[PDB]
Amino acid sequence: AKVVDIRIDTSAERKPISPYIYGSNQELDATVTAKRFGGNRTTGYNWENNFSNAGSDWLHYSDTYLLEDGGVPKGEWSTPASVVTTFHDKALSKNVPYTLITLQAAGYVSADGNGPVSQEETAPSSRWKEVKFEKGAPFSLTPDTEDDYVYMDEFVNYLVNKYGNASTPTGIKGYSIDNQPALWSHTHPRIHPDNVTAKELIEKSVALSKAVKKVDPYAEIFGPALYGFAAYETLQSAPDWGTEGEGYRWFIDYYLDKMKKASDEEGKRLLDVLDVHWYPEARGGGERICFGADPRNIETNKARLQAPRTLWDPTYIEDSWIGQWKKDFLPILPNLLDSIEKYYPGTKLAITEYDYGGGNHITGGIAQADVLGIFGKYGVYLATFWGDASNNYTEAGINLYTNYDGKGGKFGDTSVKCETSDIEVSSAYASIVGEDDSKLHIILLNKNYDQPTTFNFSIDSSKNYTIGNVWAFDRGSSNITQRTPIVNIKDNTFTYTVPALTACHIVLE
Numbered sequence: 001a002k003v004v005d006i007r008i009d010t011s012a013e014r015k016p017i018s019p020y021i022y023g024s025n026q027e028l029d030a031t032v033t034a035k036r037f038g039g040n041r042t043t044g045y046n047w048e049n050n051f052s053n054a055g056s057d058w059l060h061y062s063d064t065y066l067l068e069d070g071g072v073p074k075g076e077w078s079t080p081a082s083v084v085t086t087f088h089d090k091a092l093s094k095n096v097p098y099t100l101i102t103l104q105a106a107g108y109v110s111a112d113g114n115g116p117v118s119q120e121e122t123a124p125s126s127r128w129k130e131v132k133f134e135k136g137a138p139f140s141l142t143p144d145t146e147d148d149y150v151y152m153d154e155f156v157n158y159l160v161n162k163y164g165n166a167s168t169p170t171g172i173k174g175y176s177i178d179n180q181p182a183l184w185s186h187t188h189p190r191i192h193p194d195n196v197t198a199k200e201l202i203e204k205s206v207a208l209s210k211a212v213k214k215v216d217p218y219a220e221i222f223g224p225a226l227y228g229f230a231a232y233e234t235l236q237s238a239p240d241w242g243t244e245g246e247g248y249r250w251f252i253d254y255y256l257d258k259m260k261k262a263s264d265e266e267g268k269r270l271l272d273v274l275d276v277h278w279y280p281e282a283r284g285g286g287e288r289i290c291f292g293a294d295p296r297n298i299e300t301n302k303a304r305l306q307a308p309r310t311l312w313d314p315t316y317i318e319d320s321w322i323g324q325w326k327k328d329f330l331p332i333l334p335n336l337l338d339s340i341e342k343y344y345p346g347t348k349l350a351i352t353e354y355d356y357g358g359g360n361h362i363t364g365g366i367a368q369a370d371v372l373g374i375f376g377k378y379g380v381y382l383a384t385f386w387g388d389a390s391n392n393y394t395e396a397g398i399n400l401y402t403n404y405d406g407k408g409g410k411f412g413d414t415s416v417k418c419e420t421s422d423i424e425v426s427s428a429y430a431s432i433v434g435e436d437d438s439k440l441h442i443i444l445l446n447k448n449y450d451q452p453t454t455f456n457f458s459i460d461s462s463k464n465y466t467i468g469n470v471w472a473f474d475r476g477s478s479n480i481t482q483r484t485p486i487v488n489i490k491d492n493t494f495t496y497t498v499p500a501l502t503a504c505h506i507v508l509e
């Protein structure tokens with residue numbers, strides 16, 4: 001009989017949970033709170049005509065993929081920025097409060113949609129248009145598709161003209177400095193064949209941020225959208241890191257410090273959100289937990305359940321090259337936040353791409369719910385899952401926070417102290433609404449694989465809870481269903497036994 005104690009104090013460690021951590025990149029069967037237009041295809045996206053290039057993902061094809069996949073009405077395929085306005089229109093219509101749009105910085109964007117770009121057509125060539133951050137001439141809402149340039153500030157001006165600036169209810173709140181710069185030479189060799197240098201990335205990041213903020217002073221700039229740890233540490237062995245990195249523990253510090261320096265010289269913040277991608281390298285049963293992980297491998301599924309701990313738990317060492325050789329940089333979120341506090345205080349943190357795998361398996365759902373609780377508890381500003389609508393359990397994990405009852409019910413927006421006596425078999429997150437603890441929300445995750453877990457709850461609150469309604473998902477179904485309410489609460493204490501591998505959302509009143 002596994003017994004775990006959960007202790008909550010609704011008046012302690014109160015901290016706001018950013019509403020934007022429950023987002024996605026793709027169109028999911030879930031209620032999301034942020035939408036990101038990013039990924040490989042956005043690097044060569046040309047807002048003037050909507051063409052883009054697949055890079056290594058599809059034989060370096062320049063075509064209309066983004067229009068097709070974005071579901072843009074065919075009559076608007078030739079309208080400037082239709083891929084993006086369709087994207088943002090959809091977010092607004094779904095009551096999504098944050099839209100993050102990736103801008104182009106690798107250097108060139110598709111000039112046409114004529115198919116594969118040969119190596120002999122590597123930019124510059126007739127297949128590409130050079131990107132310039134500042135037009136330096138009056139903007140036009142009808143960009144010239146005949147010249148050799150595409151302007152980023154003109155692109156942003158077009159969007160601001162249509163939706164208002166970032167401080168308004170319909171404005172696009174953030175822009176990203178391209179996508180995974182350290183992989184430009186690998187994913188987009190026809191655009192940027194040489195490996196990005198640290199100097200180049202900083203110069204471009206500063207120039208583009210300045211350009212964007214002149215048009216919309218309220219827009220938040222996200223960067224550098226690093227693909228993974230190797231990029232965090234050395235920008236994938238950047239050619240000039242041996243010189244530029246002298247005195248820096250890792251590239252993350254250099255980036256923050258240089259953006260801070262540029263901001264101090266310019267007179268305003270040029271980097272609003274440190275943006276990184278985190279695909280867990282955690283392994284189990286001989287395979288990584290994401291990217292083709294087999295739901296039949298129990299050891300992999302068990303490793304998936306514990307992997308979220310690498311984000312915050314100092315005592316957890318996962319089975320991966322990061323867990324083995326990079327302990328000095330783990331747990332990862334605290335290390336990223338520590339760097340921010342040291343080199344550019346006030347900078348926000350966002351995980352714009354991540355996937356814990358097992359999307360159609362209960363463990364993918366529990367891990368997803370665990371990750372969201374962690375993002376909220378540790379202060380992540382925005383997060384957007386990367387994966388499609390086939391990940392039903394991942395979607396259940398999101399809805400457990402954003403729409404647990406099917407009618408808009410959501411986790412509270414203020415995190416409060418909630419401790420569990422066994423962080424290996426369980427995870428628990430608690431929250432209230434605003435500064436009011438009248439309704440206490442609790443996400444309770446039982447990671448026990450084949451046995452129920454009995455939880456003894458002890459709560460310190462100014463309110464005397466009498467009932468706890470429950471919604472949950474498990475191996476029986478990814479659909480979140482209401483369960484029998486908890487009714488025997490004595491002096492804010494109660495015992496609740498949860499079946500193995502179950503994710504619950506308890507609402508006490």
Ligand SMILES: OC[C@H]1O[C@@H](O[C@H]2[C@H](O)[C@@H](O)[C@H](O[C@H]3[C@H](O)[C@@H](O)[C@H](O[C@H]4[C@H](O)[C@@H](O)[C@H](O[C@H]5[C@H](O)[C@@H](O)[C@H](O[C@H]6[C@H](O)[C@@H](O)[C@H](O)O[C@@H]6CO)O[C@@H]5CO)O[C@@H]4CO)O[C@@H]3CO)O[C@@H]2CO)[C@H](O)[C@@H](O)[C@@H]1O
Pocket residue numbers: 038039040041042053054057058061063064065068179180227277353386
């Ligand atoms: O003439 C006959 C009819 O033609 C129709 O048009 C056709 C057209 O002729 C044809 O060429 C086109 O073919 C498309 C395929 O149908 C479509 O499936 C394919 O989709 C690709 C896409 O090109 C590619 O860019 C995309 O890349 C993804 C990648 O899969 C994904 O793994 C990656 O995720 C990474 C993140 O990006 C990265 O940030 C993170 O760090 O890592 C992630 C994981 O690695 O994301 C990228 C995108 O960013 O993959 C998809 C799927 O494979 O594209 C083909 C070329 O466009 O189909 C057209 C029809 O649909 C005419 O319409 C009709 O009138 C004619 O009669």
Ligand SMILES: [Ca+2]
Pocket residue numbers: 048129143144145146147148149150151
């Ligand atoms: Ca142009």
Ligand SMILES: [Cl-]
Pocket residue numbers: 179180181182183225226227228231
């Ligand atoms: Cl990168």
Ligand SMILES: [Zn+2]
Pocket residue numbers: 028029388389390391392395
């Ligand atoms: Zn789905």
